[PDB]
Amino acid sequence: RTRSTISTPNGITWYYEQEGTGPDIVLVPDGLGECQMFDSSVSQIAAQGFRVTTFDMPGMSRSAKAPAETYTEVTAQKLASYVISILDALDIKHATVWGCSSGASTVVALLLGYPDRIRNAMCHELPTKLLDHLSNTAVLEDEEISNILANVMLNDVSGGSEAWQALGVEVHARLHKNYPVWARGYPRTIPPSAPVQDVEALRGKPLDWTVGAATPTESFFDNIVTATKAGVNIGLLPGMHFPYVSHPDVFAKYVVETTQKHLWNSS
Amino acid sequence: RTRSTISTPNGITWYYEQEGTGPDIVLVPDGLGECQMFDSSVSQIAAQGFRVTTFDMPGMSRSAKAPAETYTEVTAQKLASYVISILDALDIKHATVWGCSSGASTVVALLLGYPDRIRNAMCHELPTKLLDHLSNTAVLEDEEISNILANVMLNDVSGGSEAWQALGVEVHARLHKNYPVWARGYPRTIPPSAPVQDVEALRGKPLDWTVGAATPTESFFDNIVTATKAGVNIGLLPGMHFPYVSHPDVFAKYVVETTQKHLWNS
Ligand SMILES: C[C@H](O)CCCC(=O)CCC/C=C/c1cc(O)cc(O)c1
Ligand SMILES: C[C@H](O)CCCC(=O)CCC/C=C/c1cc(O)cc(O)c1
Ligand SMILES: [K+]
Ligand SMILES: [K+]
Numbered sequence: 001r002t003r004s005t006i007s008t009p010n011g012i013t014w015y016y017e018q019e020g021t022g023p024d025i026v027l028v029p030d031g032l033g034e035c036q037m038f039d040s041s042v043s044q045i046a047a048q049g050f051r052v053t054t055f056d057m058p059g060m061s062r063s064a065k066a067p068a069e070t071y072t073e074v075t076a077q078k079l080a081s082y083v084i085s086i087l088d089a090l091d092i093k094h095a096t097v098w099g100c101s102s103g104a105s106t107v108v109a110l111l112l113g114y115p116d117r118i119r120n121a122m123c124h125e126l127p128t129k130l131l132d133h134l135s136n137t138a139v140l141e142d143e144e145i146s147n148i149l150a151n152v153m154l155n156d157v158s159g160g161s162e163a164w165q166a167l168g169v170e171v172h173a174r175l176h177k178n179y180p181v182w183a184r185g186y187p188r189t190i191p192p193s194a195p196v197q198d199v200e201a202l203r204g205k206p207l208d209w210t211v212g213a214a215t216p217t218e219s220f221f222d223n224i225v226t227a228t229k230a231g232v233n234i235g236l237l238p239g240m241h242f243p244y245v246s247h248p249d250v251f252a253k254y255v256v257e258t259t260q261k262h263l264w265n266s267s
Numbered sequence: 268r269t270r271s272t273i274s275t276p277n278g279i280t281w282y283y284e285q286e287g288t289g290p291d292i293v294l295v296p297d298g299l300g301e302c303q304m305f306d307s308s309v310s311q312i313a314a315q316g317f318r319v320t321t322f323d324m325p326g327m328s329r330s331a332k333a334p335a336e337t338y339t340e341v342t343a344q345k346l347a348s349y350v351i352s353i354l355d356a357l358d359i360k361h362a363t364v365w366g367c368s369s370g371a372s373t374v375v376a377l378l379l380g381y382p383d384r385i386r387n388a389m390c391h392e393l394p395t396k397l398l399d400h401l402s403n404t405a406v407l408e409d410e411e412i413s414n415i416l417a418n419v420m421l422n423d424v425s426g427g428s429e430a431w432q433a434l435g436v437e438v439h440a441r442l443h444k445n446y447p448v449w450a451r452g453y454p455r456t457i458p459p460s461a462p463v464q465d466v467e468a469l470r471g472k473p474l475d476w477t478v479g480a481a482t483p484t485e486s487f488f489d490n491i492v493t494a495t496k497a498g499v500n501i502g503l504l505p506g507m508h509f510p511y512v513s514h515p516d517v518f519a520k521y522v523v524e525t526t527q528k529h530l531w532n533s
Binding site: 057211212213214215216217218219220221224225229234236 | 453478480481482483484485486487488489492496501503512
C-alpha cells in the first residue's frame, strides 16, 4: 500500500493511498473526506486484480493544505474538477469511481462531465434536498459543531455503531476537526448542485446507484424515484450511509462485481 | 357511529362500523384485520362530508364467524372478493378504498378487478416478497406466535409504540387471538398474489401509493420502484406500517385530500 502526498496545480496538497495493479478503481470519500474509512476494502478490492486509489478530500484530514475555495461553497462540479486534477497527477486515464453523499454527487458529475475518463460510476445516497437542521450548524462554534455532528454520525447514519467507533481515536480525532469544515462548506451548496435534475442525461449511462437497506425510507426516497425514472440500476447495500465502514466485505464485493460487470460490457 | 354486523352469502358474518354521509370511503384493515385501529380517523374523515365504512376482516376479531377458506391460504384476490361482498351487502356502489399490507394488495386487486366499483385506491406498504422469518411462524404453537408477533408489532413496525399500546387492553386481547390466524393463513400466500406483476396494468389507474417515512428502505423498496415504473403517485406517510394508529390526524388528512383530488378529476 502506497501512502503519500501529491500537489496539484490548483493548490491542493493531497494525501492519497494506492494499492494493487490492474484496471483503476477510485474510492471518493463522503463529505467528511476521510479515506481511512476505506482501509479494509481497499485491500480486498485490490486483491481481485485492480489498482485502487483513494485520498482525503480538500480541506479535510490529511488533505487540509488547500485553498479556501476548495472547501467553501462546495459543489459536485467543484469536487469533480478536483478529483480529475489528482487523477491527472497520478496518471490515471480511465477509472471506475465510487462515491457516497457529496462523493455520490461528485462521481455522477465526473461521469457526465468527463465521459472519456470514467468507465462507470457507483453512487450511494446522493443528497438532493436542503436540510435546514444540517445547514444551521454552520453558524455554531467549532466545538459545538463537532460535538453535534459526531453524535449524528454515530447514532443516526453510521449504520453500525460498533464499526463506527472501531475506526479508532486517530480517525475520530481527524473527523472531529473536519466537522466544522464540512458544516460551513457543504450542506448549503451541495444539494442544489446535484447532477440529477436532467433525468434524460442519466439514461443509458454506466451508473449503478445504491441506498442503505436500513436507512429510513424518507432519507433517500428521491434517489430511488430518480434512478428508476432514468432506467438506472438501483439497489441496496447493508447498513446506512457508510457501507464501507459498517460492512466492508460486502462493500468490497459490490465494488469488485460492479467493476467486473462493466469491464465485460466494455468488451 | 353505527356498530353492527352483516352476513354475506359466502358464509361470513362481518363486524362493521359506519359513520357520516356523502361519498363512500372504505378503510380495509391490514392483515391483523382489526378495524378499531381506524377509530380516531373514521370520525375525522366522516366530518369532512363522507360516509366512512370499515370492518374486521374474515376470521379476525369480531368477524370471526367465517368459513375456514376465508382465513386460510389467503390471497389478494380472495380478500378482494370478500370486500366486494360486504360492499354489495351495504349497498355501496362506488367507493374510495384504503388498505395497508394485505389490505394494500386487496385494494389494488379491487381497483383492477372491479373498476366500475372503485373511484380510487390508496395502497400502503404492499408486500410482494416472501419473508421466511414470517412464514416460519406458521408452524409454531399459538402462544408462541402471539408472543413473537405482538413484540414485532410493538417494537419493530408500529411506527409509534405509545400509540400502539394506547389501542388498549381489549384491542390487544383481540389481536392476541388474531396473530396465529394471520400467521397460518397470510404470509405464505399473500406476497405471491400481489397484483403488481403487470406494470402496464397499473399505468393510468387512480392509484395513490405510500410507504412509511421511518420504515427501513429495504422493507418496501420494491413498492417505490414499481410505482415509479408505472407512473403511479408514490409518496410517504409519517411512521411505519400503521399510519392510522401512529399518526391518525395526518392519516385522516391524507385520505380526505386524496379522495377530494379524485372527486375533482372525475
Ligand atoms: C457523510 C456526509 O457526506 C456528511 C455528514 C452529514 C451526514 O452524514 C448527514 C446524512 C447524509 C446527509 C448528507 C448531506 C445532507 C445535506 O443536507 C447536505 C449535504 O451537503 C450532505
Ligand atoms: C400488519 C400486517 O398486515 C400483518 C403483521 C405482519 C407485519 O406487520 C410484518 C411487517 C409487514 C409485513 C407484512 C407481510 C409480510 C409478508 O412477508 C407476508 C404478508 O402476508 C404480510
Ligand atoms: K461485511
Ligand atoms: K397525527
